Design an enzyme around this catalytic site. Sequence first.
Site, PDB file in Angstrom:
ATOM      1  N   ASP A 130      50.211 -30.176-150.685  1.00 57.02           N
ATOM      2  CA  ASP A 130      49.053 -29.400-151.448  1.00 57.02           C
ATOM      3  C   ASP A 130      49.666 -27.755-151.137  1.00 57.02           C
ATOM      4  O   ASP A 130      48.944 -27.203-150.458  1.00 57.02           O
ATOM      5  CB  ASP A 130      48.331 -29.658-150.784  1.00 57.02           C
ATOM      6  CG  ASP A 130      46.967 -28.777-151.652  1.00 57.02           C
ATOM      7  OD1 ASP A 130      45.381 -28.936-151.653  1.00 57.02           O
ATOM      8  OD2 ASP A 130      46.969 -28.043-152.516  1.00 57.02           O
TER       9      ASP A 130
ATOM     10  N   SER B 208      49.478 -31.598-164.114  1.00 60.87           N
ATOM     11  CA  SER B 208      49.445 -32.728-165.381  1.00 60.87           C
ATOM     12  C   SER B 208      51.053 -33.350-164.149  1.00 60.87           C
ATOM     13  O   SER B 208      51.532 -32.919-164.909  1.00 60.87           O
ATOM     14  CB  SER B 208      49.478 -32.311-166.417  1.00 60.87           C
ATOM     15  OG  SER B 208      49.880 -33.120-167.746  1.00 60.87           O
ATOM     16  N   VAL B 209      50.851 -34.769-164.504  1.00 60.81           N
ATOM     17  CA  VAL B 209      52.761 -35.343-163.657  1.00 60.81           C
ATOM     18  C   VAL B 209      52.499 -36.650-164.357  1.00 60.81           C
ATOM     19  O   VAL B 209      51.988 -37.615-164.402  1.00 60.81           O
ATOM     20  CB  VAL B 209      51.459 -35.591-162.176  1.00 60.81           C
ATOM     21  CG1 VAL B 209      52.801 -36.232-161.283  1.00 60.81           C
ATOM     22  CG2 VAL B 209      51.588 -34.004-161.310  1.00 60.81           C
TER      23      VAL B 209
ATOM     24  N   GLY C 227      48.633 -41.013-161.750  1.00 60.75           N
ATOM     25  CA  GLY C 227      47.332 -40.141-160.836  1.00 60.75           C
ATOM     26  C   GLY C 227      46.412 -40.059-160.889  1.00 60.75           C
ATOM     27  O   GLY C 227      46.600 -40.157-162.358  1.00 60.75           O
ATOM     28  N   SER C 228      45.942 -39.090-160.815  1.00 55.82           N
ATOM     29  CA  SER C 228      44.193 -38.613-160.877  1.00 55.82           C
ATOM     30  C   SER C 228      44.032 -36.840-161.673  1.00 55.82           C
ATOM     31  O   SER C 228      42.929 -36.952-162.201  1.00 55.82           O
ATOM     32  CB  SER C 228      43.225 -38.877-160.227  1.00 55.82           C
ATOM     33  OG  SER C 228      43.368 -38.268-159.390  1.00 55.82           O
ATOM     34  N   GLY C 229      45.049 -36.800-161.795  1.00 52.51           N
ATOM     35  CA  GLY C 229      44.999 -35.027-162.047  1.00 52.51           C
ATOM     36  C   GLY C 229      44.572 -34.245-160.716  1.00 52.51           C
ATOM     37  O   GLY C 229      45.064 -33.241-161.037  1.00 52.51           O
TER      38      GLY C 229
ATOM     39  N   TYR D  66      46.370 -32.768-158.672  1.00 52.45           N
ATOM     40  CA  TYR D  66      47.859 -32.000-157.951  1.00 52.45           C
ATOM     41  C   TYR D  66      48.227 -31.111-159.632  1.00 52.45           C
ATOM     42  O   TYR D  66      49.159 -30.335-160.412  1.00 52.45           O
ATOM     43  CB  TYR D  66      49.080 -32.480-157.014  1.00 52.45           C
ATOM     44  CG  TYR D  66      48.810 -33.540-156.432  1.00 52.45           C
ATOM     45  CD1 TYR D  66      48.531 -32.205-155.228  1.00 52.45           C
ATOM     46  CD2 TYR D  66      47.317 -34.197-156.331  1.00 52.45           C
ATOM     47  CE1 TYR D  66      47.953 -32.836-153.827  1.00 52.45           C
ATOM     48  CE2 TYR D  66      47.433 -34.952-154.967  1.00 52.45           C
ATOM     49  CZ  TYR D  66      47.541 -34.738-153.795  1.00 52.45           C
ATOM     50  OH  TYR D  66      47.174 -34.169-152.394  1.00 52.45           O
TER      51      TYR D  66
ATOM     52  N   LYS E 210      55.914 -32.683-162.881  1.00 54.08           N
ATOM     53  CA  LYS E 210      54.467 -31.846-163.260  1.00 54.08           C
ATOM     54  C   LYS E 210      54.561 -30.892-164.654  1.00 54.08           C
ATOM     55  O   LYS E 210      55.708 -29.882-164.311  1.00 54.08           O
ATOM     56  CB  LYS E 210      54.058 -31.195-161.685  1.00 54.08           C
ATOM     57  CG  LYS E 210      52.748 -30.436-162.130  1.00 54.08           C
ATOM     58  CD  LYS E 210      52.537 -29.435-161.657  1.00 54.08           C
ATOM     59  CE  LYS E 210      51.293 -28.117-161.200  1.00 54.08           C
ATOM     60  NZ  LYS E 210      50.728 -27.797-160.269  1.00 54.08           N
TER      61      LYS E 210
HETATM   62  N1  RUY Z   1      52.218 -27.982-155.552  1.00 52.49           N
HETATM   63  C1  RUY Z   1      52.232 -29.520-154.800  1.00 52.49           C
HETATM   64  N2  RUY Z   1      51.665 -29.622-153.451  1.00 52.49           N
HETATM   65  O1  RUY Z   1      51.789 -31.073-153.890  1.00 52.49           O
HETATM   66  N3  RUY Z   1      52.387 -31.387-154.813  1.00 52.49           N
HETATM   67  C2  RUY Z   1      53.326 -30.655-155.983  1.00 52.49           C
HETATM   68  N4  RUY Z   1      53.246 -30.458-157.068  1.00 52.49           N
HETATM   69  C3  RUY Z   1      53.236 -32.241-156.876  1.00 52.49           C
HETATM   70  C4  RUY Z   1      53.451 -32.615-158.848  1.00 52.49           C
HETATM   71  C5  RUY Z   1      55.371 -32.194-158.249  1.00 52.49           C
HETATM   72  C6  RUY Z   1      55.480 -30.503-158.433  1.00 52.49           C
HETATM   73  C7  RUY Z   1      54.497 -30.373-156.745  1.00 52.49           C
HETATM   74 MG    MG Z   2      44.003 -28.502-151.647  1.00 50.64          MG
END
Ligand code: RUY
Ligand code: MG
Length: 348
Positions: free
Chosen positions: A164, A33-34, A27-29, A31, A49
């Site tokens: 989200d 640090s994933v 990803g791009s960051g 959401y 995450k």
């Molecule tokens: N809190 C969130 N909303 O959308 N996506 C989320 N996170 C994405 C990465 C794993 C944890 C949850």
């Molecule tokens: Mg948003």
Amino acid sequence: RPTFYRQELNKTIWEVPERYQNLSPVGSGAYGSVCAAFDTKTGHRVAVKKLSRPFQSIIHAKRTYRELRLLKHMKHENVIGLLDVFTPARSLEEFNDVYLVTHLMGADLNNIVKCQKLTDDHVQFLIYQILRGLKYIHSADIIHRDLKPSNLAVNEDCELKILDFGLARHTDDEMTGYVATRWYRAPEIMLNWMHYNQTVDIWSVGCIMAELLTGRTLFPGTDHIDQLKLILRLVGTPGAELLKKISSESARNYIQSLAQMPKMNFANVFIGANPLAVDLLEKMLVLDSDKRITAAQALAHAYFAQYHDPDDEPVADPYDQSFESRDLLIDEWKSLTYDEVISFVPPP
Ligand SMILES: Nc1nonc1N1CCCCC1
Ligand SMILES: [Mg+2]
Ligand SMILES: [Cl-]
Ligand SMILES: [Cl-]
Ligand SMILES: [Cl-]
Ligand SMILES: [Cl-]
């Protein structure tokens, strides 16, 4: 307690249970640090995450608690849910980092669909799933506030989940200019006309549905004022009934400076579209939020006749969010978060 192993990822040391293998930044960051991983217990590709030192301030500590509370509650086919939550710490005294695990989402609506219009059958199924998830969200008295194509994950079988929850509120700078993060917002929240409620999310669904039908953004404003002018050209300027409900005296004064305009004919805007889709758009894209259709009402509209099943559109368990109005110290938010980590029970 599982055995944990360590490795360097995203500029820090990640420490995770052995069940998670083949970690890779993803990803791009947007959401957090994933990393993507393979979960050997379930057989799923997952997103992991890491919240690094998330108790640095009262604002951050409460935000961490909020994200964990929301993700632990959401249990619906069309909404993101929590597969696991863990910490390598063995006690509250050494608790410092939190990790969250969900299914790994490949594509979203707008990496897949940008600049392209879809067939009517596809539009029916995608909007149906958004409304099914939204009925569930709203039944728990949660307002999403940020429905947009990038927050809708979609797989090869056209199955959809809403993303989200519990992230930082969007800034003034993020909302400035020619930006997708404002194009889907209802006018009363974009311009702070009044105390808003869950009806803001139905406006966003209407903007998404229009874009799937035409392949084009409905209200691509270059700034807040340009966007308001695009909105009022389509739906008309406000009448005296709605003007009374605008509790901002300055916003009410600005609105009266604009020449009055009638609502346009939607059949001449969305040329060739299914007449039932045109009818539904007219019921979502209403300026007075009190008069918009709700998610539960919209599921029963004839446009969704091939998918609607009132025995398979569930509501949520009650969600206690009294914490949102509570003032606590950093270490008190931290202790509440630790309790929610250790009490987690995984899905079947
Ligand atoms: N809190 C969130 N909303 O959308 N996506 C989320 N996170 C994405 C990465 C794993 C944890 C949850
Ligand atoms: Mg948003
Ligand atoms: Cl393990
Ligand atoms: Cl820790
Ligand atoms: Cl988007
Ligand atoms: Cl609760």
